[PDB]
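Submission sheet (multi-component)
Chains listed below:
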Amino acid sequence: SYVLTQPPSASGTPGQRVAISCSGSNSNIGSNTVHWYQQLPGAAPKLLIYSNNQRPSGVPDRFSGSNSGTSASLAISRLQSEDEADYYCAAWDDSLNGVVFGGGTKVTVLQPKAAPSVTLFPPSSEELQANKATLVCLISDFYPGAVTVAWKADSSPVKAGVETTTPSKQSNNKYAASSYLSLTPEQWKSHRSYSCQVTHEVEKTVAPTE
Amino acid sequence: TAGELYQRWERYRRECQETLAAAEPPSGLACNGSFDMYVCWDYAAPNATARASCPWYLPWHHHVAAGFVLRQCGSDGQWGLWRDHTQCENPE
Amino acid sequence: QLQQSGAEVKKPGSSVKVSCKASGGTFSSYAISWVRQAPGQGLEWMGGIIPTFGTANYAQKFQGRVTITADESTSTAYMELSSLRSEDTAVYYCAQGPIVGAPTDYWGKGTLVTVSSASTKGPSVFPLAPSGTAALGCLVKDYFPEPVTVSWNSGALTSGVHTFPAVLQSSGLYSLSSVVTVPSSTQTYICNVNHKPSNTKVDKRV
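Outcome: structure written.
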């Protein structure tokens, strides 16, 4: 149900050309003109290029559209920081009714790689008292934004019963993720220690106790 | 059917486009000849109201064919903020 | 340029009708199209209608689910979705345009529709930080639906405030935590948390 944007992502360096290809079949792109939308984090989609490389008000010549014979292409020929976004190509479809979009492509611009900061908290006393226990491992300021989290119950054994969020871009130019381990005051009071190991890009571990 | 109307819109521009491409800018200051994707516009006299033919890609054309979209040109010769769409649309 | 209806929370198998409210004038003339976005994913076209003309247009696979209509007066075009689903949890935008198949230069803010069987519930707060600077904060556990607003000291404490986006652990329930970073230094710190849907506000110390 998708004209595939070729790319889940595409990279680029400031002042260089970045190309996002969008492939299709002959009832969609072959038979019509491809559009291009730019969506920004926390924002609605925004028309970038309509109708095969024409543009709307206030859009620089930086952006350019391509043939549509089999697959189309968007070309951002001089990159910027404000150019990192989701890019969704679109076309009408002859075979089966209305317009169809692509999978979109998140585009990336290149800044310094940071080191994740993890703080790890033990279940509160007041919570234990409630017969629930939660170990909470928070992770902040790590670029790029891909991190994995391994919980350990006492010395090595691994831990299945956790819940982890996704690396949201928030606040300042960067991402964070929180991870919870749910236990029972017994499983808690029954182990020599507990480890939250955040592995990013290398390994960091932190270990409350009791 | 929608496909046909859409193709027609796709034509109404790529027509407005080649006229605009044929059209040479005025001597004095004027609002840009441009395609707003809805209607196609002439270069506009300074500080005046530009008249546009009701678009043909628009169904219920023939009712309104004689009609106009009125859009004002800026003092500068910058295209104004809003359009006056009536005589071009009244299906009732 | 169009003001949509505002967020909706619904249980699966149910129906939701969200509104797209246009300009009092300049309405009937252009095609209104509805596009939805599942959180973290790409766009999906649903259908479009020239409000005052003919019948609505749709895409296949919504079959007998989406109904797009429009009203003369209120100059609003609503849309209705039946047999609701988790795959229907998304945000719904209404984009204005020249014709139905054509591109759209004018969008709305979008209206988020969350769908889960989870009951409306308030959170419970626990003090963190048994505690070279100081990091403390409050764990907000097991609430629904989102969001929850977290404050420090009746307000007026921010510097060093990070609030982490909620995790959805599958009870259907959301859980988050907030951390103030500080100098190790006698001043009493209290987190004021708010969840409007269940009308639950808490102040708890550290």
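Remark: The CA atoms of residues 28 and 61 of chain C lie 27 Å apart.
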